[PDB]
Design an enzyme around this catalytic site. Structure first.
Site, PDB file in Angstrom:
ATOM      1  N   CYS A   1       0.853  -1.185   0.000  1.00  0.00           N
ATOM      2  CA  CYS A   1       0.000   0.000   0.000  1.00  0.00           C
ATOM      3  C   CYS A   1       0.888   1.234   0.000  1.00  0.00           C
ATOM      4  O   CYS A   1       1.971   1.230   0.631  1.00  0.00           O
ATOM      5  CB  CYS A   1      -0.948  -0.035   1.196  1.00  0.00           C
TER       6      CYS A   1
ATOM      7  N   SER B   1       0.590   3.687   1.811  1.00  0.00           N
ATOM      8  CA  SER B   1       0.851   4.103   3.213  1.00  0.00           C
ATOM      9  C   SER B   1       2.090   3.419   3.794  1.00  0.00           C
ATOM     10  O   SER B   1       2.789   3.990   4.622  1.00  0.00           O
ATOM     11  CB  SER B   1      -0.326   3.817   4.092  1.00  0.00           C
TER      12      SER B   1
ATOM     13  N   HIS C   1       4.810   5.508   2.674  1.00  0.00           N
ATOM     14  CA  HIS C   1       4.871   6.768   3.439  1.00  0.00           C
ATOM     15  C   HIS C   1       5.782   6.594   4.662  1.00  0.00           C
ATOM     16  O   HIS C   1       6.375   7.596   5.091  1.00  0.00           O
ATOM     17  CB  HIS C   1       3.469   7.195   3.871  1.00  0.00           C
TER      18      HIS C   1
ATOM     19  N   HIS D   1       0.515  -3.666   6.575  1.00  0.00           N
ATOM     20  CA  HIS D   1      -0.803  -3.607   7.207  1.00  0.00           C
ATOM     21  C   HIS D   1      -1.912  -4.192   6.369  1.00  0.00           C
ATOM     22  O   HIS D   1      -3.009  -4.350   6.921  1.00  0.00           O
ATOM     23  CB  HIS D   1      -1.163  -2.167   7.570  1.00  0.00           C
TER      24      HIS D   1
ATOM     25  N   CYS E   1      -6.898  -3.466   3.386  1.00  0.00           N
ATOM     26  CA  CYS E   1      -6.711  -2.001   3.308  1.00  0.00           C
ATOM     27  C   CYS E   1      -7.322  -1.447   2.037  1.00  0.00           C
ATOM     28  O   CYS E   1      -8.353  -0.770   2.142  1.00  0.00           O
ATOM     29  CB  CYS E   1      -5.263  -1.571   3.431  1.00  0.00           C
TER      30      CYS E   1
HETATM   31  N1  LIG Z   1      -7.739   6.804   4.504  1.00  0.00           N
HETATM   32  C1  LIG Z   1      -7.321   5.558   4.520  1.00  0.00           C
HETATM   33  O1  LIG Z   1      -7.783   4.714   5.323  1.00  0.00           O
HETATM   34  C2  LIG Z   1      -6.305   5.136   3.536  1.00  0.00           C
HETATM   35  C3  LIG Z   1      -6.176   3.800   3.198  1.00  0.00           C
HETATM   36  C4  LIG Z   1      -5.271   3.413   2.190  1.00  0.00           C
HETATM   37  C5  LIG Z   1      -4.521   4.386   1.565  1.00  0.00           C
HETATM   38  N2  LIG Z   1      -4.581   5.664   1.951  1.00  0.00           N
HETATM   39  C6  LIG Z   1      -3.858   6.700   1.273  1.00  0.00           C
HETATM   40  O2  LIG Z   1      -4.489   6.884  -0.011  1.00  0.00           O
HETATM   41  C7  LIG Z   1      -3.504   7.363  -0.943  1.00  0.00           C
HETATM   42  C8  LIG Z   1      -3.510   6.504  -2.189  1.00  0.00           C
HETATM   43  O3  LIG Z   1      -3.020   5.206  -1.905  1.00  0.00           O
HETATM   44  P1  LIG Z   1      -2.726   4.209  -3.107  1.00  0.00           P
HETATM   45  O4  LIG Z   1      -3.885   4.145  -4.004  1.00  0.00           O
HETATM   46  O5  LIG Z   1      -2.157   2.960  -2.462  1.00  0.00           O
HETATM   47  O6  LIG Z   1      -1.555   5.056  -3.800  1.00  0.00           O
HETATM   48  P2  LIG Z   1      -0.961   5.043  -5.279  1.00  0.00           P
HETATM   49  O7  LIG Z   1      -1.077   3.686  -5.850  1.00  0.00           O
HETATM   50  O8  LIG Z   1       0.417   5.667  -5.141  1.00  0.00           O
HETATM   51  O9  LIG Z   1      -1.926   5.973  -6.112  1.00  0.00           O
HETATM   52  C9  LIG Z   1      -1.830   7.402  -6.084  1.00  0.00           C
HETATM   53  C10 LIG Z   1      -2.167   7.945  -7.464  1.00  0.00           C
HETATM   54  O10 LIG Z   1      -2.140   9.372  -7.373  1.00  0.00           O
HETATM   55  C11 LIG Z   1      -1.628   9.899  -8.606  1.00  0.00           C
HETATM   56  N3  LIG Z   1      -1.195  11.262  -8.422  1.00  0.00           N
HETATM   57  C12 LIG Z   1      -0.041  11.690  -7.853  1.00  0.00           C
HETATM   58  N4  LIG Z   1      -0.046  13.039  -7.868  1.00  0.00           N
HETATM   59  C13 LIG Z   1      -1.202  13.462  -8.478  1.00  0.00           C
HETATM   60  C14 LIG Z   1      -1.786  14.742  -8.853  1.00  0.00           C
HETATM   61  N5  LIG Z   1      -1.190  15.876  -8.535  1.00  0.00           N
HETATM   62  N6  LIG Z   1      -2.987  14.686  -9.420  1.00  0.00           N
HETATM   63  C15 LIG Z   1      -3.638  13.557  -9.695  1.00  0.00           C
HETATM   64  N7  LIG Z   1      -3.078  12.376  -9.467  1.00  0.00           N
HETATM   65  C16 LIG Z   1      -1.888  12.333  -8.829  1.00  0.00           C
HETATM   66  C17 LIG Z   1      -0.527   8.908  -8.964  1.00  0.00           C
HETATM   67  O11 LIG Z   1      -0.125   8.987 -10.320  1.00  0.00           O
HETATM   68  C18 LIG Z   1      -1.153   7.553  -8.554  1.00  0.00           C
HETATM   69  O12 LIG Z   1      -1.781   6.865  -9.637  1.00  0.00           O
HETATM   70  C19 LIG Z   1      -2.173   7.400  -0.201  1.00  0.00           C
HETATM   71  O13 LIG Z   1      -1.912   8.680   0.372  1.00  0.00           O
HETATM   72  C20 LIG Z   1      -2.408   6.430   0.955  1.00  0.00           C
HETATM   73  O14 LIG Z   1      -1.540   6.628   2.033  1.00  0.00           O
HETATM   74  C21 LIG Z   1      -5.508   6.038   2.931  1.00  0.00           C
HETATM   75  O1  LIG Z   2      -3.230   2.819   4.237  1.00  0.00           O
HETATM   76  C1  LIG Z   2      -3.864   2.971   5.518  1.00  0.00           C
HETATM   77  C2  LIG Z   2      -3.217   3.990   6.443  1.00  0.00           C
HETATM   78  C3  LIG Z   2      -3.805   5.210   6.737  1.00  0.00           C
HETATM   79  F1  LIG Z   2      -4.943   5.584   6.181  1.00  0.00           F
HETATM   80  C4  LIG Z   2      -3.214   6.116   7.569  1.00  0.00           C
HETATM   81  F2  LIG Z   2      -3.777   7.287   7.834  1.00  0.00           F
HETATM   82  C5  LIG Z   2      -2.034   5.775   8.219  1.00  0.00           C
HETATM   83  F3  LIG Z   2      -1.466   6.658   9.053  1.00  0.00           F
HETATM   84  C6  LIG Z   2      -1.420   4.571   7.947  1.00  0.00           C
HETATM   85  F4  LIG Z   2      -0.287   4.263   8.549  1.00  0.00           F
HETATM   86  C7  LIG Z   2      -2.018   3.688   7.090  1.00  0.00           C
HETATM   87  F5  LIG Z   2      -1.427   2.513   6.851  1.00  0.00           F
HETATM   88 ZN   LIG Z   3      -3.133   1.072   3.414  1.00  0.00          ZN
END
Ligand SMILES: NC(=O)c1ccc[n+]([C@@H]2O[C@H](COP(=O)([O-])OP(=O)([O-])OC[C@H]3O[C@@H](n4cnc5c(N)[nH+]cnc54)[C@H](O)[C@@H]3O)[C@@H](O)[C@H]2O)c1
Ligand SMILES: OCc1c(F)c(F)c(F)c(F)c1F
Ligand SMILES: [Zn+2]
Ligand SMILES: NC(=O)c1ccc[n+]([C@@H]2O[C@H](COP(=O)([O-])OP(=O)([O-])OC[C@H]3O[C@@H](n4cnc5c(N)[nH+]cnc54)[C@H](O)[C@@H]3O)[C@@H](O)[C@H]2O)c1
Ligand SMILES: OCc1c(F)c(F)c(F)c(F)c1F
Ligand SMILES: [Zn+2]
Ligand SMILES: [Zn+2]
Ligand SMILES: [Zn+2]
Lengths: 374, 374
Positions: B46, B48, B51, B67, B174
């Site tokens: 993921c 995250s 990150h 995770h 996730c």
């Molecule tokens: N809230 C939650 O519970 C939760 C859960 C899982 C992931 N996340 C977050 O969600 C985000 C996405 O996760 P993912 O899908 O695994 O990531 P990912 O696979 O890196 O996808 C992100 C996408 O964003 C695109 N991108 C980057 N910059 C821009 C821009 N300026 N405009 C438009 N597109 C852009 C990029 O090309 C990529 O396809 C990350 O920040 C994670 O940490 C949050």
């Molecule tokens: O991808 C899920 C995910 C989150 F949405 C968070 F906000 C975070 F802090 C983290 F560690 C995480 F794994």
């Molecule tokens: Zn995640």
């Protein structure tokens, strides 16, 4: 009769920011097609009218302000179907055209015909009905209620009960409806919940009234003016707190008092900092915060989006979320059936000629609502 | 037998930020009371987890990250009642203690036992079950799935269908559940609506799947990487737009495309600027915008609160709003009943030993989900 004729009457003209209103003669043109000319009976002093004076709100000057009011139709333009001469009416500063995508949406009320987002200070047709000293004068929000007579578009007026006491129900034109709807319609306050209300003026008191009507168990009023606390408790606050009394920031205080954050918070002041504080003090996973206060023109707030990622909901609303033309007559009917009270909001009454004294009372902190009578 | 004994096994240890994982032997202590030791079968990569590597997320190091995973219970501590040795399980990086005010709330899911807000990198008891080269190693979100064996608290594990294909259903831990729930549960996308999804990675594709399941008429995918567009259309996007292709800001483009703003928008990237753009592009009176992307540590955004005052709703959520232990088994059962697809998210399947190559595929823009198999 006056129908079809220019009316000369007194209005409160604002020529310049940060100056008293000038009570002086204006010329009020007759209504064009789909316009309504109203003899005003009562108007309230809302803090948003003061925002025009202070430049918190920017709208073109010179202007006839006023938006919280009630009156009697003097005449109607061609094609008007929803009011008649002699009807009691409330001007609608948020219009309801009934035709735009917002008016057709079940939960929208910020009609696209509004003059709030990009203020022109005109009628719908881009012109003014007011002249003063031979100079055109701007409208405000399509209402301009600080005048013995105004002209409004038909989408900016609602017919109300003929037996309405206009010196009370003018508050349904802004402060009551806004605060009450922000609680009951926008936030959807639940029975047994804990609410925090920032700002205990006429709108914040109406938020408290709505939280109590919705069955909240705790309603915490927050104001830096402790003179506001007695009336807040009268209309339903269970506790009041003054941020100036505490060493810690009031979001921390409210989180402690609510054993981890409130269910619903409301910003009812108009400060960027209290908008962020109000969001922060609602519970991080399921809290809801509603912005009601008008922010200073063109200024941005700063906030940490982790406050939202954990689960908070942040929203704002105009006019309590009410579709204005549908809702105002029903709110008047409910007032007539004693479903809510307006007297707690009315602290002072003055003749219209004493408008500047009415603004002094608001600015000193002494009043909630002053009602001006024409 | 391993039960009651220290297990020496392989894990991916992150000793410092911005360095590769070190794939080496760790010691895994046996589970204490109310803990569960899991033999991992599959784990997803993921953003995250990346990150943690990049310092976007701050958590104590050294750490075993991971995770999004599934495995088989090896042993249980005294007092465990919800899983047994041999059960298929998904670790829950958002726990469900069942006792806190959030777990008891109908709409809360960010359990107060989480290790996200104030990361300790431990078990619930404040200690670690991991040793590497004689040094204690932190946990991550109570899960630490980049290891052949992990130990989790009972409140951080769910039992799933014994016939589950673990190399697919790990995504319910996730990315799938987060995106799908963000659409169906948090935003509550409506039939016939227009949605905009910013970010077309595994989470954003799952948001599209949820918007399509909810009956959206239009789903506009937004990404700077046009290689993401084909899969986004496969899973339900009706249009895709690349902000780099336009002279205007993309909020203006999306407002124009949607004839005045979208019904629902989603930020699924993790940028402050796209959080504000996504809010702006939803219709000003009734639009909803959901923040899903994890923002960079300790950074604030700037925004004009008039965006909210007109009527917009802004919210965020963890794990799609799902109460984790209640929801994960039902989502697996739904997958087994063919209610949604997971294969569209899986672009690469690598042995666990290639974890670093999997992270390089994500960072290069080349993958959606890589599944690591133990
Ligand atoms: N809230 C939650 O519970 C939760 C859960 C899982 C992931 N996340 C977050 O969600 C985000 C996405 O996760 P993912 O899908 O695994 O990531 P990912 O696979 O890196 O996808 C992100 C996408 O964003 C695109 N991108 C980057 N910059 C821009 C821009 N300026 N405009 C438009 N597109 C852009 C990029 O090309 C990529 O396809 C990350 O920040 C994670 O940490 C949050
Ligand atoms: O991808 C899920 C995910 C989150 F949405 C968070 F906000 C975070 F802090 C983290 F560690 C995480 F794994
Ligand atoms: Zn995640
Ligand atoms: N959203 C809408 O449709 C709508 C409608 C009507 C009014 N408004 C706005 O709502 C706000 C309140 O209007 P009102 O009730 O007429 O005004 P008001 O009577 O001036 O009340 C504001 C209250 O805020 C208190 N206050 C000032 N600063 C602070 C502080 N830092 N902390 C706590 N309390 C403080 C103050 O003492 C006063 O009692 C204004 O900004 C109006 O412009 C919005
Ligand atoms: O008090 C109601 C009110 C508002 F809520 C505004 F946002 C505004 F701009 C305005 F002029 C006004 F009068
Ligand atoms: Zn007002
Ligand atoms: Zn309209
Ligand atoms: Zn809990």
């Amino acid at each position: 009769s006056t129908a079809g004729k220019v009316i000369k009457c007194k209005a409160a003209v604002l020529w310049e920011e940060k100056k008293p209103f000038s009570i002086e003669e204006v010329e009020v043109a007759p209504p064009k097609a789909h316009e309504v000319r109203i003899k005003m009976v009562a108007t309230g002093i809302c803090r948003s009218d003061d925002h025009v004076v202070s430049g918190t709100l920017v709208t073109p000057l010179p202007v006839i302000a006023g938006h919280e009011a009630a009156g009697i139709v003097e005449s109607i333009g061609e094609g008007v179907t929803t009011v008649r001469p002699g009807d009691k009416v409330i001007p609608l500063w948020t219009p309801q055209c009934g035709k735009c995508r917002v008016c057709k949406h079940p939960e929208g009320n910020f009609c696209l015909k509004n003059d709030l987002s990009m203020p022109r200070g005109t009628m719908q047709d881009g012109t003014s009905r007011f002249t003063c000293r031979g100079k055109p004068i701007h409208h405000f929000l399509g209402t301009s209620t600080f005048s013995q007579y105004t002209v409004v578009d038909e989408i900016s007026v609602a017919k109300i009960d003929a037996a309405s006491p206009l010196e009370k129900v003018c508050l349904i034109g802004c402060g009551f409806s806004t605060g009450y709807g922000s609680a009951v319609k926008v936030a959807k306050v639940t029975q047994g919940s804990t609410c925090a209300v920032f700002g205990l003026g006429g709108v914040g008191l109406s938020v408290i009234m709505g939280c109590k009507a919705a069955g909240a168990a705790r309603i915490i009023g927050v104001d830096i003016n402790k003179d506001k606390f007695a009336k807040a408790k009268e209309v339903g606050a269970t506790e009041c707190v003054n941020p100036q009394d505490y060493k810690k920031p009031i979001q921390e205080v409210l989180t402690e008092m609510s054993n981890g954050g409130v269910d619903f918070s409301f910003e009812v002041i108009g400060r960027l900092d209290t908008m962020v504080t109000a969001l922060s003090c609602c519970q991080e996973a399921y809290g809801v915060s509603v912005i009601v206060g008008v922010p200073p023109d063109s200024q941005n707030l700063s906030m940490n989006p982790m406050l939202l990622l954990s689960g908070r909901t942040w929203k704002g609303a105009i006019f309590g979320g009410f579709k204005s033309k549908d809702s105002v007559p029903k709110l008047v009917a409910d007032f007539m059936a004693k479903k809510f009270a307006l007297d707690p909001l009315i602290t002072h009454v003055l003749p219209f000629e004493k408008i500047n004294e009415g603004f002094d009372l608001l600015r000193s902190g002494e009043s909630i609502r002053t009602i001006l009578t024409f």
